[PDB]
Amino acid sequence: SEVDVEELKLEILCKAIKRDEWSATDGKDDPIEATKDSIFVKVLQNLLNKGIELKGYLPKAETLLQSEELNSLKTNSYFEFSLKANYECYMKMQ
Amino acid sequence: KTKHLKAAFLRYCRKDILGAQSMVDSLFSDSDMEPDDELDLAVNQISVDLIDDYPASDPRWAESVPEEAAGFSNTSLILLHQLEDKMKAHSFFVDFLHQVGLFSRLTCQTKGMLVATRLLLSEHAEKLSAAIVLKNHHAKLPVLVNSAIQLALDKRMCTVPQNLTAADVYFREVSQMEIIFECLVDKEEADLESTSIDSVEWANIVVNVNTILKDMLHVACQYRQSKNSLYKNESGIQEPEHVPWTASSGTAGIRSVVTRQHGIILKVYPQADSGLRTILIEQLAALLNYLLDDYVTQLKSIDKLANEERYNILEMEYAQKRSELLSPLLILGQYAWASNLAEKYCDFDI
Numbered sequence: 419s420e421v422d423v424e425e426l427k428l429e430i431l432c433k434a435i436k437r438d439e440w441s442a443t444d445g446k447d448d449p450i451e452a453t454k455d456s457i458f459v460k461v462l463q464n465l466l467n468k469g470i471e472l473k474g475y476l477p478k479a480e481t482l483l484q485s486e487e488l489n490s491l492k493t494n495s496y497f498e499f500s501l502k503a504n505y506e507c508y509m510k511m512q
Numbered sequence: 513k514t515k516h517l518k519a520a521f522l523r524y525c526r527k528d529i530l531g532a533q534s535m536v537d538s539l540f541s542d543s544d545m546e547p548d549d550e551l552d553l554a555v556n557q558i559s560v561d562l563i564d565d566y567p568a569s570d571p572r573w574a575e576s577v578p579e580e581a582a583g584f585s586n587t588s589l590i591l592l593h594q595l596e597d598k599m600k601a602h603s604f605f606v607d608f609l610h611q612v613g614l615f616s617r618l619t620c621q622t623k624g625m626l627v628a629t630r631l632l633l634s635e636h637a638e639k640l641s642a643a644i645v646l647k648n649h650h651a652k653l654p655v656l657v658n659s660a661i662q663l664a665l666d667k668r669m670c671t672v673p674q675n676l677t678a679a680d681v682y683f684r685e686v687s688q689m690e691i692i693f694e695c696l697v698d699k700e701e702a703d704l705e706s707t708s709i710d711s712v713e714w715a716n717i718v719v720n721v722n723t724i725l726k727d728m729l730h731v732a733c734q735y736r737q738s739k740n741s742l743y744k745n746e747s748g749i750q751e752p753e754h755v756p757w758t759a760s761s762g763t764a765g766i767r768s769v770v771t772r773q774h775g776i777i778l779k780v781y782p783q784a785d786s787g788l789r790t791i792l793i794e795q796l797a798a799l800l801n802y803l804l805d806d807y808v809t810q811l812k813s814i815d816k817l818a819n820e821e822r823y824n825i826l827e828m829e830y831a832q833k834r835s836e837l838l839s840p841l842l843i844l845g846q847y848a849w850a851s852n853l854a855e856k857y858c859d860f861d862i
Binding site: 433447497498500502503506507 | 585587588589593616673675
């Protein structure tokens with residue numbers, strides 16, 4: 419609580435989208451979030467059969483607080499289409 | 513008035529959670545008017561106006577209760593799962609009419625279609641919410657181009673991203689996206705260069721649209737086999753579903769939906785110049801479509817009462833001169849399908 423845990427938790431997940439590069443091909447969304455995609459595939463170790471509460475265990479990541487940092491980087495207009503879209507099949511994954 | 517519809521829409525909001533309060537706001541709705549002929553047709557235009565907001569965007573019952581109604585982001589890519597949630601929302605909506613009751617109020621004339629009862633409009637908004645999920649399941653560049661042309665013809669689109677181009681309002685009116693994805697198969701056809709045997713790929717795109725308009729009519733039919741009435745099609749209810757009833761959608765024979773079907777039959781002009789197996793698959797396809805049109809005319813004719821018979825016998829001659837125009841078309845075609853067409857409009861003996 420002194421050194422800011424959840425500030426860094428955002429700093430990293432935001433540069434995890436800057437490297438992705440949200441683009442568009444012929445007027446259609448380009449999901450660059452291939453690394454953000456993969457990292458959310460890597461958090462789950464199938465802990466459903468490990469007896470861990472995996473169901474409801476991604477509220478580590480923030481959401482409205484994230485687009486605050488996206489505004490600072492000037493990248494909200496590019497990525498906010500698939501940030502929410504992938505955050506829907508991350509509420510079905512969880 | 514608008515206050516009454518917006519009070520029932522707020523009692524459906526509580527019906528997902530508990531019934532006791534919403535059953536007293538239906539008991540206080542026996543402080544109604546009670547003259548059958550038009551004031552029960554004034555709570556009809558309320559139950560209908562909510563079955564048009566449940567197929568639309570976030571339905572105006574939502575806010576107070578944040579059920580499966582909730583203002584789902586229109587910048588999401590979750591368009592199909594979001595519209596599955598709305599066939600479920602329109603399903604618990606028909607149940608929270610059936611229990612609260614909601615056992616009356618009834619369509620008249622709409623777009624050349626005559627319909628016996630308002631309750632056919634719930635079934636009609638359900639069939640055309642199964643149609644939407646079917647053409648959301650099939651998303652490819654030709655169909656999405658034919659859509660973008662249709663939507664831009666009806667009106668302009670907002671260019672603040674948000675470009676499916678949209679769908680929530682083209683589901684309440686998906687019937688229009690079939691008369692135009694035909695006019696975009698014809699302007700694609702003008703550039704198909706199918707003058708004779710040279711063109712091939714271009715007679716494959718005319719069939720890809722024929723398959724989708726067809727399986728969309730298959731979906732309206734099977735959603736009229738999944739009835740709930742214990743008298744109307746007992747199969748699929750508490751009785752064996754191993755034998756489905758009449759495979760008609762109970763459609764009322766639209767004069768623009770029917771015209772685009774009798775247009776794409778006369779795209780039997782391709783079977784003149786086409787490889788042998790291809791001419792059969794589009795023939796089985798145009799047979800599969802016509803056996804939904806002759807089925808909806810049969811279901812509508814069955815519902816006619818004995819008086820006003822002059823209009824009933826003139827609608828018979830009109831269908832009989834179309835089974836008779838569907839026949840010269842299949843007099844050049846395979847007669848292995850004639851046995852089926854004859855059984856489908858199960859007489860058509862001539």
